[PDB]
């Protein structure tokens, strides 16, 4: 991408912000146990390495 902006005189910073589909599925199989499975699909927070 390439944003062309007005030349402000002080060091600003762009704030691009994509759109993803991050959701959770909290599961409570039995007493005192809670687990979740997050999933951000486009910009996945996890992959094979991590």
């Amino acid at each position: 991408m390439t944003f062309e902006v007005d030349p402000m005189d002080e060091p600003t910073l762009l704030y691009l912000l994509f759109e993803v589909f991050d959701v959770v599925r909290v599961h409570q199989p039995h007493r005192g146990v809670i687990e979740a499975v997050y999933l951000r699909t486009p910009f996945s927070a996890g992959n094979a390495t991590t």
């Binding site: 599961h27 199989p29 039995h30 146990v33």
Partner: peptide, 22 residues
């Protein structure tokens, strides 16, 4: 080499459990 028993905490994405008899 005790036992690989696999009946069908828990997790929602798999209907699999394993018994280990030692």
């Amino acid at each position: 080499s005790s036992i690989g028993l696999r009946p069908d905490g828990r997790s929602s994405f798999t209907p699999n459990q394993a018994y280990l008899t030692l």
